[PDB]
Write a protein that holds these residues in place. Structure first.
Motif: not given
Lengths: 61, 61, 106, 60, 65
Positions: A25, A33, A28-29, A46, A22, A43, A17-18, A38
């Motif tokens: 994506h 993160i 994975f992002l 960091l 989606i 915090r 499927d499209l 991030l």
């Protein structure tokens, strides 16, 4: 970028499927993160990272 | 043009163009530069703009 | 009337000249009023100001400074509810346009 | 007529009704890349009981 | 009265909001000079000119350093 690239590459290269492309994506992002410092919780880590970046430019002087 | 990037697709090469940051005067010459890969095509439906922002953040790290 | 006392006090505060009987006080004051009366700028564009505020917010979100981004949005949205707004904003903006990026510990 | 309206959405895929009889609620107020995510949504009151939830979701 | 003190309260509230604006934007302005420029802006004065004068007097006090 080898674990997460592999995860992404699987769930795109099969995806029937499209929407599966989606929702491949998206996660994975968000994994990237999380692996990078991030988050709204990481915090504090960091903050120390910025101070380990400070002394590098200090030493140059 | 000098390096191996040249052979790659004109679509993605077209979509890669520079952007700049705000508050430029006070030197900080290293904070000002950015790469924005702009998406406006049909594939914007799968590469959504809120993840485009995330790519800039990971680029910055 | 209050305007004149204010320009005096601005000279005293920023220039560090607390004695009005210093000639340097009167020179700084004459400079200040002559600058005020030399009309050379366009009037403030509220939309350009709005764009700049929004971009400041985007720069904060790009740099993962969410407490600063959330503070920036919250403070600006509260301030813009009851012209002179955009004025003071542009003022502060130009005033120290250096980089001023760290400014943490809300 | 219901089964006529189903194949107006498989073999046509363009929905147009002035009455609520089908389980898709189209949005003809904008979209150009947000089309996929939002323009068609499940009307949860015109699913009949000889059509299970799986079937309706996939036809949309 | 009472409503003439409530207005003085809400004004100081909005000024405090701007005071937090000034510290997170890392602007060198303080409470006193901004209290000056607000009463300036009540008669109407261009902030480009306010900024042009403060950028000079701030550079006349690094000259006293």
């Amino acid at each position: 970028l080898e674990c997460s690239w592999d995860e992404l590459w699987n769930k795109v290269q099969q995806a029937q499927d499209l929407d599966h492309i989606i929702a491949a994506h998206e996660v994975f992002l968000d994994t990237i993160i999380s692996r990078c410092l991030l988050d709204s919780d990481s915090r504090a880590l960091l903050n120390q990272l910025r101070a380990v970046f400070d002394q590098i430019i200090e030493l140059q002087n | 043009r000098a390096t191996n990037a040249q052979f790659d697709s004109p679509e993605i090469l077209r979509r890669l163009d520079v952007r700049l940051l705000e508050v430029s005067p006070g030197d900080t010459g290293w904070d000002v530069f950015s790469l924005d890969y702009h998406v406006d095509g049909p594939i914007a439906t799968v590469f959504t703009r809120e993840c485009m922002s995330h790519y800039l953040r990971v680029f910055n790290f | 009337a209050q305007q004149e006392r204010d320009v005096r006090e601005l000279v005293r505060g920023v220039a560090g000249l607390q004695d009005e009987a210093d000639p340097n006080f009167q020179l700084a004051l004459n400079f200040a009023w002559s600058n005020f009366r030399f009309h050379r700028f366009l009037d403030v564009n509220s939309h350009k100001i709005e764009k700049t505020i929004e971009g400041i917010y985007e720069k904060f979100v790009i740099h993962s400074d969410l407490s600063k981004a959330a503070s920036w949005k919250r403070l600006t949205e509260e301030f813009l509810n009851a012209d002179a707004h955009y004025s003071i904003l542009s003022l502060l903006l130009c005033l120290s346009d250096s980089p001023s990026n760290s400014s943490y510990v809300e | 007529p219901v089964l006529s309206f189903l194949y107006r959405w498989i073999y046509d895929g363009e929905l147009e009704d002035t009455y609520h009889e089908f389980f898709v609620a189209s949005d003809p107020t904008v979209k150009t890349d947000r089309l996929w995510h939002d323009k068609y949504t499940l009307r949860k009151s015109m699913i009949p009981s000889f059509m299970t939830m799986d079937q309706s979701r996939k036809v949309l | 009265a009472a409503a003439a003190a409530a207005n003085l309260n809400a004004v100081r509230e909005t000024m405090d909001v701007l005071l937090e604006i000034s510290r997170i934007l890392n602007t060198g302005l303080d409470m006193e000079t901004l209290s000056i420029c607000v009463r300036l802006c009540e008669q109407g004065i261009n902030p480009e000119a306010l900024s042009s004068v403060i950028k000079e007097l701030r550079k006349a006090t690094e000259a006293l350093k």
